[PDB]
Amino acid sequence: SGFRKMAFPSGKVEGCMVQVTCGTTTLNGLWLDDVVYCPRHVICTSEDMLNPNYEDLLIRKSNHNFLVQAGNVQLRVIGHSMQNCVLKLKVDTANPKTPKYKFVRIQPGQTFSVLACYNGSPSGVYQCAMRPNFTIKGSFLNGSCGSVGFNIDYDCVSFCYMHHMELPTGVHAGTDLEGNFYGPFVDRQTAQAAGTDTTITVNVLAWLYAAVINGDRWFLNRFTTTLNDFNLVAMKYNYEPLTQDHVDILGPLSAQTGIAVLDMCASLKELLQNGMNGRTILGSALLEDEFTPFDVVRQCSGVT
Amino acid sequence: SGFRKMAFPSGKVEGCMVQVTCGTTTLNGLWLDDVVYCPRHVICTSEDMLNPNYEDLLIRKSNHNFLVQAGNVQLRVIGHSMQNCVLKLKVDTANPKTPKYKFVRIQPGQTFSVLACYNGSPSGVYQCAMRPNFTIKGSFLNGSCGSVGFNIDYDCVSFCYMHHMELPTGVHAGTDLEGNFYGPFVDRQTAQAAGTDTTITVNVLAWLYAAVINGDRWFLNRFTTTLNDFNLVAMKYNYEPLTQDHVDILGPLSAQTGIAVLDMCASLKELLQNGMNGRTILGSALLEDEFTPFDVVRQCSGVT
Ligand SMILES: *CC(=O)NCc1ccc2c(c1)OCO2
Ligand SMILES: *CC(=O)NCc1ccc2c(c1)OCO2
């Protein structure tokens, strides 16, 4: 019993983190097979960042300008290319600790673990969600760029995020491992404002199910609702609309707890309208939206 | 910028987790050097758990009754002993992935990472605190016993916790790696009630400092207080008393932010008396007490 914001075990990803230096810029790279993936802004001065032309900056860079260190051993760079906003550095050594892996572009609402790294060295691991405005609310200091977000399916690491920048509001933007930013962000030190950070309704519902499973039931009410009625309330409260796809995804939690999805919706409706009245659910005074239905099933069933 | 509940990277501990089976009971063990440490209740039936005599139960057990599996390879058990509430299984192979390690008994308020494991396989990692009533609020299902709590100092894992049981209230109790329970708990399926789960005041203050550092300042007020005045309010609100030792520990955060500890105390006082008024601090609607001053310095400075 009990329900915790839980990251994936980080060992498989720890074994992939390296330091990438280009001139005076040091950040993290991800070493998979004989390729080191890192943010392309490794080639920039903080001056360059104001208005970088990456193709033009990259012309001035040779393989030997990319210093790649894995532990305290230097890797030989034998090729480099830009793919969108990441550099792929070909090295002469396959990472012997390469896990089975995929590159996946996640949808907003999807959760993943971040292994925060500095100089290629893991400092910590935490659980994040792709916000509906395609930001994440991370913990990233200067040097943390190239830290990666990931999910694990048994023995396969799906890399979904690489850290690139902090917006002036101190929320985070980055790319998939093909170098494509989540959302409209660019790797340039310019005014970039996030859109509305809406609540991930399907994640809140999952977490309400997690609460019932773990004995926190005080918020269960006598009401039901409809998707349309619920959605009017959701919209008013900057919650994402709930679709029948979301209702389908919650089916197993519905079945386990015997609480119809639309009944749990009506409970959430009353919580939005009435607030918590100083009460907590699973030790939180606000409605947690950084657990997916899959996350709740995983943690409640003990998947390894 | 940003501040996350952050666990230590788990790789060093993942490399130590094994499955221990005695008859029909399977749980996790920690393999360090040629010793596998696991909860002594591995020898119990759920019937035994009602009133176990462990010395008497252990007489019926030989080395070959302890089945130790590391990945999908069996370790040979060549000795076993009971130390308090843990078994030490001597194996003929030193764990080749043994990190530098210590066994440490932590104080209440102290935070650590848990690597939740089932059948010796890591499922997840989360950050905990030893509650002032010597419980922890974990996420543990049947099979999770022998999962360990730890801190990392650069390359040295300090193991502080091994999971043993869930109280009827669904909070958790366990031992240090010498097998001594935190608090008054016993490895017996009997009524065991926790004492008052008070708030770890020094941890709240650290986290208020973390909030100021990361730009959340709305709660800073125009007041100061004294340790005695603050403590009267703290006591009333089931907060632990603040000592001069706590004030000393917060000194560096005080210095970094230019906010005197007693001023931050007066801010916390007003938050207790006035509540959050629907506002959040670092994305929380309640005052977080599971970051130590050391945790706040570490995450705010990016230690690896
Ligand atoms: C996010 C990141 O690490 N990018 C590279 C970088 C940015 C700013 C900065 C440093 C590195 O070092 C000091 O300041
Ligand atoms: C906490 C733990 O894993 N202890 C051993 C154990 C207790 C209950 C239980 C099982 C193992 O398997 C099923 O139920």
Curated annotation (Swiss-Prot), chains A, B:
It is found in: Host cytoplasm; Host Golgi apparatus; Host nucleus. There is a cross-link at residues 5, 90 (Glycyl lysine isopeptide (Lys-Gly) (interchain with G-Cter in ubiquitin)). The active site is at 41 (for 3cl-pro activity), 145 (nucleophile). Residues 1-304 form the Peptidase C30 domain. Changing residue 205 to V: In strain: Zeta/P.2. Changing residue 49 to A: Does not affect ability to cleave and inactivate human TRMT1. Residues 1-304 are cytoplasmic. Inhibited by pyridone-containing alpha-ketoamides compounds 13a and 13b. In turn, alpha-ketoamide 13b (tert-butyl (1-((S)-1-(((S)-4-(benzylamino)-3,4-dioxo-1-((S)-2-oxopyrrolidin-3-yl)butan-2-yl)amino)-3-cyclopropyl-1-oxopropan-2-yl)-2-oxo-1,2-dihydropyridin-3-yl)carbamate) inhibits SARS-CoV-2 replication in human lung cells. Inhibited ex vivo by michael acceptor inhibitor N3. Inhibited ex vivo by compound 11a and 11b. It catalyses: TSAVLQ-|-SGFRK-NH2 and SGVTFQ-|-GKFKK the two peptides corresponding to the two self-cleavage sites of the SARS 3C-like proteinase are the two most reactive peptide substrates. The enzyme exhibits a strong preference for substrates containing Gln at P1 position and Leu at P2 position. 3CL-PRO exists as monomer and homodimer. Only the homodimer shows catalytic activity. Interacts with host FBXO22; this interaction promotes the proteasomal degradation of nsp5. Cleaves the C-terminus of replicase polyprotein at 11 sites. Recognizes substrates containing the core sequence [ILMVF]-Q-|-[SGACN]. Cleaves and inactivates human TRMT1, preventing tRNA guanine(26)-dimethylation of tRNAs. May cleave human NLRP1 in lung epithelial cells, thereby activating the NLRP1 inflammasome pathway. May cleave human GSDMD, triggering alternative GSDME-mediated epithelial cell death upon activation of the NLRP1 inflammasome, which may enhance the release interleukins 1B, 6, 16 and 18. Also able to bind an ADP-ribose-1''-phosphate (ADRP). This is 3C-like proteinase nsp5. It comes from Severe acute respiratory syndrome coronavirus 2 (2019-nCoV). The lineage of its organism: Viruses, Riboviria, Orthornavirae, Pisuviricota, Pisoniviricetes. The chain holds residues 3264 to 3567 of 7096 of the full protein.
